[PDB]
Curated annotation (Swiss-Prot), chain D:
Outcome after substituting residue 25 to I: In strain: Gamma/P.1
The organism of origin for this protein: Severe acute respiratory syndrome coronavirus 2 (2019-nCoV)
Cystine pairings recorded for this chain: 30-41
Entry function: Subunit of the fusion protein that is processed upon entry into the host cell. Mediates fusion of the virion and cellular membranes by functioning as a class I viral fusion protein. Contains a viral fusion peptide that is unmasked after S2 cleavage. This cleavage can occur at the cell membrane by host TMPRSS2 or during endocytosis by host CSTL. In either case, this triggers an extensive and irreversible conformational change that leads to fusion of the viral envelope with the cellular cytoplasmic membrane, releasing viral genomic RNA into the host cell cytoplasm.
Protein known as: Spike protein S2'
UniProtKB/Swiss-Prot annotation, chain E:
Subunit structure, interactors included: Binds to host ACE2. RBD also interacts with the N-linked glycan on 'Asn-90' of ACE2. Cleavage of S generates a polybasic C-terminal sequence on S1 that binds to host Neuropilin-1 (NRP1) and Neuropilin-2 (NRP2) receptors. Interacts with host integrin alpha-5/beta-1 (ITGA5:ITGB1) and with ACE2 in complex with integrin alpha-5/beta-1 (ITGA5:ITGB1). May interact via cytoplasmic c-terminus with M protein. May interact (via N-terminus) with host bilirubin and biliverdin, thereby preventing antibody binding to the SARS-CoV-2 spike NTD via an allosteric mechanism.
Residue pairs linked by disulfide bridges in the UniProt entry: 60-73, 86-95
Result of altering residue 79 to Y: In strain: Gamma/P.1, 19B/501T, 19B/501Y, Omicron/BA.1, Omicron/BA.2, Omicron/BA.2.12.1, Omicron/BA.2.75, Omicron/BA.4, Omicron/BA.5, Omicron/BQ.1.1, Omicron/XBB.1.5, Omicron/EG.5.1
Source taxonomy: Viruses, Riboviria, Orthornavirae, Pisuviricota, Pisoniviricetes
Effect caused by changing residue 97 to A: No effect on O-glycosylation by host GALNT1
Entry function: Attaches the virion to the cell membrane by interacting with host receptor, initiating the infection. The major receptor is host ACE2. When S2/S2' has been cleaved, binding to the receptor triggers direct fusion at the cell membrane. When S2/S2' has not been cleaved, binding to the receptor results in internalization of the virus by endocytosis using host TFRC and GRM2 and leading to fusion of the virion membrane with the host endosomal membrane. Alternatively, may use NRP1/NRP2 and integrin as entry receptors.
Species this chain originates from: Severe acute respiratory syndrome coronavirus 2
Positions annotated as glycosylated: 46, 59, 81, 100, 102, 126
Phenotypic consequence of residue 101 to H: In strain: Eta/B.1.525
Gene label: S
Designated name of the protein: Spike protein S1
Listed result of changing residue 57 to G: In strain: Alpha/B.1.1.7, Beta/B.1.351, Gamma/P.1, Delta/B.1.617.2, Epsilon/B.1.427/B.1.429, Eta/B.1.525, Theta/P.3, Iota/B.1.526, Kappa/B.1.617.1, Lambda/C.37, B.1.1.318, Zeta/P.2, Mu/B.1.621, 20A.EU1, 20A.EU2, Omicron/BA.1, Omicron/BA.2, Omicron/BA.2.12.1, Omicron/BA.2.75, Omicron/BA.4, Omicron/BA.5, Omicron/BQ.1.1, Omicron/XBB.1.5, Omicron/EG.5.1; common variant; binds to hACE2 more efficiently; produces more infectious particles when cultured in primary human epithelial cells; does not significantly shift SARS-CoV-2 neutralization properties
Range within the parent protein: 558 to 710 of 1273
Amino acid sequence: GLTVLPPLLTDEMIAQYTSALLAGTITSGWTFGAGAALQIPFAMQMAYRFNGIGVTQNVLYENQKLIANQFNSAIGKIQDSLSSTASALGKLQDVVN
Amino acid sequence: SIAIPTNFTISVTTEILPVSMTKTSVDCTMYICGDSTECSNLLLQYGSFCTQLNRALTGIAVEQDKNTQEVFAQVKQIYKTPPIKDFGGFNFSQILPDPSKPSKRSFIEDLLFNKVTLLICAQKFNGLTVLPPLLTDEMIAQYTSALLAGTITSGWTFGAGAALQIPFAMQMAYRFNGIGVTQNVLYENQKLIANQFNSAIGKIQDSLSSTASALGKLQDVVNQNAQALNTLVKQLSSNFGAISSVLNDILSRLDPPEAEVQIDRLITGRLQSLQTYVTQQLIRAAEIRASANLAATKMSECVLGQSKRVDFCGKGYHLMSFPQSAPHGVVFLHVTYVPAQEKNFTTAPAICHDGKAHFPREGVFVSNGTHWFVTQRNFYEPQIITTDNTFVSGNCDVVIGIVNNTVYDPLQPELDS
Amino acid sequence: SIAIPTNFTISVTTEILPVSMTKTSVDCTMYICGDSTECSNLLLQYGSF
Amino acid sequence: SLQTYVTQQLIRAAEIRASANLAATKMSECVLGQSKRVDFCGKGYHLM
Amino acid sequence: KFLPFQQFGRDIADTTDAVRDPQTLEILDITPCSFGGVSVITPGTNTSNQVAVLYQDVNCTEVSNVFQTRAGCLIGAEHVNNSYECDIPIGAGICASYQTQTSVASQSIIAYTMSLGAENSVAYSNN
């Protein structure tokens, strides 16, 4: 009698929610959660987000190549670290266990 | 390409949070035994299970009173709105209390109190007392009145220290400055914003007294409590293996030597039922305490201040919130600034004037197609590009996407002498 | 004396949060009794556990 | 045995609901905005 | 309305709440006694050994210092008419503190209605 019901949202729909979130964050910014998505160049969204942490825009518009390289390298490092160590997702694995 | 809103819509939203639940208190000996003594002498053998269950339920009840005290009693004092209500055009009469009634609840609180339908006797005769809340609703509805009268008259400053009066038309200018929109957007659209606020409050009133399931969370809390109590009562009609589910037919038909085993079967069954009830009520009370902590934080941040936390105080940019009491819960009317009437433009990170990059001080560079302006980021209000709203931080050869234009120095015309 | 940074590093960090768990559902009569009827008539005595 | 299982699953589900509320808040603030809450969205000043 | 073959009558808990006399066939109405629970409001034993008693959810006609509240009937505490902060909570807005009223003709437990806070009124004006 130990049935295991299936989740209502299949993973192909969860992966579409997250895709929508990514495609709204990248293209619009923080304004797709407030109201309707407002497009803006990502080089300018990241300048907004630099102003948010107390650093002016010229720090980014004059270092856009370096910042983009650091972002790409950090994402590559995340990818490398995920498919290196098995215990990267220990919290989820312990819930399942 | 950038899109900048040209108008806005004030959108009052609602958010119901459960704060407490009924302070039930199940006596143990009366439920398990029911004034019998042959039964109580056998229940004494099981140690202090009855004391543990009573302790757990009393802790739950004290917690339910602490929840309400934590949520609503955010005010050191009790404020009153002045009799002359010239709040800049905004009409809070649906939110401010109606003095006509004996219970000084407002119109929206009255609508909220009729949709929660709070048998209830046959429970009582088995020791299933229901304690009354420490704060009667005429006291909770005075806490919320104080919070409203402090928010309207003083602002966010009645939570920090002592209330500091300020015209509401100016508190709203502060609260646009908070979301990144300058004051001249409210001081020039005060009538429109007041009309939108009044219409949104009217729509909230219409929506509350239209649909029965507006307060489903509170109704489901009440239903869970009532259903747990109902099954606890119904468990008293089970044999648990005994020859009958009533002690007065076992005692009156069997000598104690062989009646003891049947009484003990009923003791074990009813004690297990009561332990299950207490455990599930402990878990439910943990749920309600988490919800009450969330409601307390929402009060402290949405109501007593203005939160920059996205989607904490409603969908959109947060202006202010209004607390309205509800049966075993609280209702927040999150007033939010929602942009609307978008418009595509052409943007640029900076502007070359003399081989020197000009960046916008606060705002964006946009162009209606041929002329370059500098607006706010959340409301299209295009100023001309002077050197009082742009700052020079380098040269024309480093920025990626910089465009050519002229930055109008105001001082040289003023030196037309 | 004050120390002011002169460069920066953009550092993407991960963070895993459990959101749900398996939606198991345990029937009683098949577990406790298992299609038996002599057992089910005795389990009926325990009320609505 | 079944009651013990159900009780422990209730406590575990409360744990997971707390974690899910935390994840929903992290989405709403870190992802849909840019939080000024320190160490809420990672060590350092948060960009996205 | 008992049908001729109906002798007893039960509730959800399988306890009879209606019976019919086997001599005069009238419809009675069984109901257990006016039971309840007793709470004991008390200051610290260090401070005093006088205790008020609260009979929870009981109209205390069951038997000077008798106070009937929504929480029940409070016996042993005088109902003062002013309001202070809440020291011992009884329920439905009624608290009870051990206050030495005058230090002469004193040593009593009072039972007031909880005060929400210092009344205030902001001098709001449009300018």
